Design an enzyme around this catalytic site. Sequence first.
Site, PDB file in Angstrom:
ATOM      1  N   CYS A  28      25.703 136.169  43.525  1.00 13.94           N
ATOM      2  CA  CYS A  28      26.942 136.337  42.775  1.00 13.94           C
ATOM      3  C   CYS A  28      27.815 135.130  43.098  1.00 13.94           C
ATOM      4  O   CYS A  28      27.879 134.697  44.238  1.00 13.94           O
ATOM      5  CB  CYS A  28      27.658 137.630  43.162  1.00 13.94           C
ATOM      6  N   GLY A  33      23.279 138.160  46.918  1.00 15.86           N
ATOM      7  CA  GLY A  33      24.067 137.112  47.532  1.00 15.86           C
ATOM      8  C   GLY A  33      23.997 135.843  46.730  1.00 15.86           C
ATOM      9  O   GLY A  33      24.013 134.735  47.273  1.00 15.86           O
ATOM     10  N   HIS A  68      34.891 140.380  43.994  1.00 15.63           N
ATOM     11  CA  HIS A  68      34.341 141.482  44.767  1.00 15.63           C
ATOM     12  C   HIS A  68      34.035 141.085  46.202  1.00 15.63           C
ATOM     13  O   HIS A  68      33.790 141.947  47.034  1.00 15.63           O
ATOM     14  CB  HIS A  68      33.145 142.163  44.077  1.00 15.63           C
TER      15      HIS A  68
END
Lengths: 5, 5, 5, 5, 5, 300, 301, 300, 301, 300, 301
Positions: free
Chosen positions: K145, K143, K41
């Site tokens: 991930c 932030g 992503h």
Amino acid sequence: XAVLX
Amino acid sequence: XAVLX
Amino acid sequence: XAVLX
Amino acid sequence: XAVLX
Amino acid sequence: XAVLX
Amino acid sequence: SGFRKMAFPSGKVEGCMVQVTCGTTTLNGLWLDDTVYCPRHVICTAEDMLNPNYEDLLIRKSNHSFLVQAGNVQLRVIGHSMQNCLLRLKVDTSNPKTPKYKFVRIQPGQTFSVLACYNGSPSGVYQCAMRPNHTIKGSFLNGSCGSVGFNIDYDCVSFCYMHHMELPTGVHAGTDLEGKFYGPFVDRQTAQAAGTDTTITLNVLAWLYAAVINGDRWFLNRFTTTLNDFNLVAMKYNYEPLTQDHVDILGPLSAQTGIAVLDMCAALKELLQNGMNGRTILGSTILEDEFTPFDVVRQC
Amino acid sequence: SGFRKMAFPSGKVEGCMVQVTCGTTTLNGLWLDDTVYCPRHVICTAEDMLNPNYEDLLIRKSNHSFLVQAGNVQLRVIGHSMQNCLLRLKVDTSNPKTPKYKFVRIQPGQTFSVLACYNGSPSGVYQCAMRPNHTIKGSFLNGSCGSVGFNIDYDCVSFCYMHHMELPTGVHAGTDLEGKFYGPFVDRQTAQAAGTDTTITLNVLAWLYAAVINGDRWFLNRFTTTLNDFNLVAMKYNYEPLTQDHVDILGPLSAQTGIAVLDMCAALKELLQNGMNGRTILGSTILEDEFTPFDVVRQCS
Amino acid sequence: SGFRKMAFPSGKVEGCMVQVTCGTTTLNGLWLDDTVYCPRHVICTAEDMLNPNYEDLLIRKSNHSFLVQAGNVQLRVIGHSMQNCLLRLKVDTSNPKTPKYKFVRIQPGQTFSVLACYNGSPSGVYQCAMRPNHTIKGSFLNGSCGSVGFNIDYDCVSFCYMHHMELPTGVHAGTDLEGKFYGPFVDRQTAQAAGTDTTITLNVLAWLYAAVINGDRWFLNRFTTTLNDFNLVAMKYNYEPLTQDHVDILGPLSAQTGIAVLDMCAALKELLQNGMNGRTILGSTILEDEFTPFDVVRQC
Amino acid sequence: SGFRKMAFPSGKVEGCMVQVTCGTTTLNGLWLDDTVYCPRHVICTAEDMLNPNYEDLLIRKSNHSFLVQAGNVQLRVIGHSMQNCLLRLKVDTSNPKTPKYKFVRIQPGQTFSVLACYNGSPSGVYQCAMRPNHTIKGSFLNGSCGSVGFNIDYDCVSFCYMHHMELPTGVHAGTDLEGKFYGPFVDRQTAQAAGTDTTITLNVLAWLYAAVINGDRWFLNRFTTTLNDFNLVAMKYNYEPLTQDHVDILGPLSAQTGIAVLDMCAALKELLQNGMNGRTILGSTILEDEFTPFDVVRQCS
Amino acid sequence: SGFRKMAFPSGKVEGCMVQVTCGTTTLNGLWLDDTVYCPRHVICTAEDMLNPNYEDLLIRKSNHSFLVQAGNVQLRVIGHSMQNCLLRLKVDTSNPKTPKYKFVRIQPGQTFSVLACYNGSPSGVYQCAMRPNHTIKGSFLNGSCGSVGFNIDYDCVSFCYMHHMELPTGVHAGTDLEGKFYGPFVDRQTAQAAGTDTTITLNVLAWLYAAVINGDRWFLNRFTTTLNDFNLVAMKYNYEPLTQDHVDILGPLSAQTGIAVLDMCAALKELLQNGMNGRTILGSTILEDEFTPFDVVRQC
Amino acid sequence: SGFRKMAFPSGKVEGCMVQVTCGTTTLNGLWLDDTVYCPRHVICTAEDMLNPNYEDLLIRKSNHSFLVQAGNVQLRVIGHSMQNCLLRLKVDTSNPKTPKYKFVRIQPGQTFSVLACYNGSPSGVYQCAMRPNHTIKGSFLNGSCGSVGFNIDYDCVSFCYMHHMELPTGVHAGTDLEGKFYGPFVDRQTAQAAGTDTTITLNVLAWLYAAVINGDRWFLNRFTTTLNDFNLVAMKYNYEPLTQDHVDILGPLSAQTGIAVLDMCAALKELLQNGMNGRTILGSTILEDEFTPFDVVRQCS
């Protein structure tokens, strides 16, 4: 008895 | 069931 | 059923 | 504990 | 709420 | 149709309720013929009530200490005489409104109406059940202490309760009209406390029948179950654990027969449980299991 | 109307049954296109039984130690190879009655049809489920090993089982059609024994529906209860031991609603066990004991 | 203490209760003075069925087709007017027991004892609410029509409900004494709706206040505490008193949450005193303390 | 979202971790620049633990009765010196991985992380709070001593705990990084037991905020509505809107019980959109509404 | 050490047992001082016993019909007189071997010795418990019908049973020495049949304690469980089903701590069940589950 | 002595943490040899969030829309490719601190260690189990991930989890290190929700042993029972309601054996529930009620 027929 | 009475 | 006995 | 009342 | 950070 | 908790028409009883003042203390009184009954302890003030010595308090008094009033009329107190926990006050007037009446001692589980009144006047009325722990749960403010409980049939009023106290748990105790407390309570403000009360079965069944006559009816049917409340009774009789894809899998036969899986489970569950009682399922007994969901849809 | 154990119509699969012979010993095998699958113990004599070395016994067998045959119309065995627990044996011709077919690997709980065969010739078809423990409770007498089990799956025959041995228990083991045994077992007469069973539920529910469909539904209309049974729950939930006398008192109502006490009892018998579940009796979400039975006869004729 | 649906005493009202009868139908009549009221369908006989035509029903039964009986003597019926949905029936002898009375139109949200009678005889009494949907949820089986809902309020019996019919779903609805039905229904026999109904928010606050006056008092802000009040409630459970600079350092956290630290304190102080009733704070039951406000800030 | 009990990446501290053995007794060592600190009593045997005169018991010993192993690498100990309850061993090599470091003395109530080491190697990292009694509640095993406790500010590792002993109660106790014991304890297999331990108020509050921030608001005793805010959650669940008269009607009860209307609105509001969760108002599971403000004043004079 | 079912030394009682012949019919008799007691029905023959009319049978007899014999000595029968279901025979000799004695009525659960004898001579003796269903299970051949049950203490023999009949279920009934049957039995050969008997708790606990004094002790310990008798109480509190490779997997920590998995399961099982009662496990409450079998072996 | 939640020493895995940037958006990634894995992503802007087309957005990205970097020591992105839910991104150099490593795919119930990272930099290590429902209850803020989870397995680091999203519940989802999500979920902000949980038993038994080892064993010495509890079983098994009085009568024995009634009671309390199992009390295989308590005081002093 285990007996492969 | 709408009745009197 | 039971006996006297 | 209880009240009469 | 589904929320990929 | 309808079902409501319903007190007896208070009328017949309304007119036997008198005031009984004795000092700065006022209770109610149940006045029948030429006698007025009412808790003893009216011969008390705040500062007594301790572990009081009744009779050592009674007849420190005499006939002039008692202010009996049928609303308007003052009634005159010829003779006073204690009776267990009541007071039988004797008076110069048979009460003209006295009803065909009888004194009974109600049994736990039975019910009466309470005509709760303050300063000898009917405030309200409501039905009340005698717990099997002998207390009973009504609405009683201080100053209600004469008000009575009764049942009616035809015309005979039946007095079975006269109200004395409120155990610290918030429930109320009292006495039959012989003045003997319902239960193990003494009329005296002490560390006493209600029994450990239990639910009244026959009255719950009674009620259920009533739920059915107003066709509330649902519960009557087989109940259903949940998934892992089923596996819970699988491992019992030794069955594979049932699962979510095991259920949508039975979809087809659910839909076809119109019976949720979980409602079928429910019955599989009792079949294990309570047996099968000499009934045959598809000429069988032992629950067949070599037929898959499909082996069924094919054959049908 | 009617429910009996039904086997898939054996027609298509009979077409495929042949016998296989390794000089004296005779299994039956599956003739499909030009391969003939059959148990790998055919390459034995009741001497290697105990605990044979297959890879050895096979590697000493010629390509024509194998007399395959179908009706008679004898087939010569052009090639051969041991694939797990089967032998492949490619033959000199192809079964002109090979059907559309597949080698699925059934899963415990799934029934299939079995085609008991003896020396390459039909005989019996019956219905079986692969128990959760990995045996199946078949009917197999001597010289049936190589019998197969199949399911029909729209136009296609899906073979799922071929027969090897029998545990001392009295059950039967076997392999899928790619030589892999269903279970822990191995093809040697060394006394293994079967896991413990447990019933397959899915199939008992499936069976239960079948009964509904066929007009057997009493088991839905559920329970009634015994008095001493109730008082067990009554005591559990601080209810008052229900007694003979009570049951009479109730009579009058138990009559005119149609719902006799002990049944109504099964109804209270767990209205407490597992809740009212969001719902409401007489606008109530609790159970209401503050009404005598006379109280209720009274409030309605 | 205590709290129950209890109705007004029914004495005043039972004595004005008679059994109006119009040939084939007997029902209940409220008997005040010389005016004995009762429902305007006492006249009918079944084929007034689903469609009743009222207004013209008499030169047909001009008087004398009305029994109307009390105690067990009788009332000659010397008149009759068609008051809206009922009938005033001017009668020879007046009622000796006619209690001072208003006649009111109550409005949704409010309560009133109903006295259900069958054959001019009362049998029970109980409370009832005019739902904002203009139905009441009562207990009337056939014979009940004409039974009356009444309040009291100072010696003077108000009146507000003459009972008429029962819609499909269990509830009933009826008229005031002035005659106009409560709600948008009609004494027809045609199936009719019954609003949506909402929850009587004034009542639910009243009732909450009721529960508070009973000590059943567990809901909300009754909380905020000061420092010292905590600091001492503190070392009652071995929680190391907390100073000003403590509060100062919780600040950044106080701000993200908008919970003044003293409200947290209060919140905790409660949990120290009444425990948790076993609920998870982040999955514990034992307040954690191996986290500093620093590490809490770090992690958020 | 979320909230777990986490620790600082042991990495920086992992590479200062060396093994200090002197004959069978092996434990752990912190290796900064060119020193390794580790408990005294590395110079012990299990027969002199109870009454060990440390000063002098070191000597008899010397720079070659300490082999310090960092990996499989030795480093010559080139000087021993006791330092309170530590030992300053001077190695002939400065640690290429020595980080921005510094010694500190944690005050009770401040979490630090711990790197549990056995035989010179990290086993696991987990984090302790320094209880006000001066014990920590770790998970230390025989052979673990010299496991350190650090904290990390940006770039710079900050040590505050070397680990020595383990009280009978099941807790632990050690020294700072210049060997000054935390609390009233000494490395002396004896009478030592833990002074009574009070809870850390601050960290319970901090924790409660951690809770709010995360969804857990139930324990929260507050708020307020306005007849407006309230009216808007009232509609949400088909209630009457509280018209300004109702607020007036209420007055009386609102005066009896010292509880201003709104606070009961705020209080209902709240309990409306949350439920009761198994509690009963006037012995009822549902919110009642057939008692008008009068019937309440009527009954509770 | 040892624990055996043990009758009282029959001696004291042996010498009060007499023969009582009356026709071709002979029972036993308990002879004390100048009276011999024994079942009535001795005044019966086979052909009676139906629904017999006693007293209509008694005193068709008189003193000469009764052959009382203390072994050698014939005793003489001055006066006979019925007593509930006994017979008080009066005799010309106080029995020299009479013991300090008393007549009691044993309570269900209590025990006595039975001195069972035929033709008035001690055949054997054995202990016997009074079921709570009032029957009691001994060895009684026909012709034993006088023999008694007693307890001893110091020197006072206490007679509490005299034996009349054998209900068709194979159990026996009888009477105290006032002649009143234990339970609801009539002495008369009819379709009667024992109650529905239930086990005697306090006597089973009693016994268990005895199993412990001879250090049989095993049961005392925590019990164990089986596998799918555990999953059975998994799904309850919502736990993954435990399995056979889940068990050998815990091998290591079984061996290390020396505690079979299934015995640990057992306790996991009660921890669910009866709670945890304010005890902490590793300073916890809620049963931790984010620790694998190994995460444990590593840390230890 | 001691038991705390312990995370594997993060040292080896820190070595591998870098940040990945797709112009503005910044995940962290795993640098191993010369590949850098990171959530797919990253090739997004909080506009495609809703329900992105990855295969499209990726196919419009150059090879250097990617600014990978480690410390600084910037790495240029020589190649790139979307592998399930990760991007590979091959880089211009190889992590000189790649450790021995593996891409296991953990199984529900198995704990692993998590290394919360923010823009390629350590920060926190804590311990997690992959719930049976397929979420894990971590601590992950924005932030993060691309944070990973790992287990150490003798000399080898076995990576099992990398972090993608968070369900509304408050839990967290993610993928194994080959781009396959743990569970039903997908990487799109479209409100999915998690199966229902259930506790992991194995780990509760493992935990229970841990308590034994640490000297907490009361829960073994099992039960004692409440009187009303017993009489439930007593009634079930046709035993006689045990009462207050009885309990006294027993006193004398309950004393001198040391085993007070209600405990002895828990002992009978299912000696009936589940048998004597082959064994024998006082040479008996049934329970013996034909002995009063005096009978037993009598037969032994």
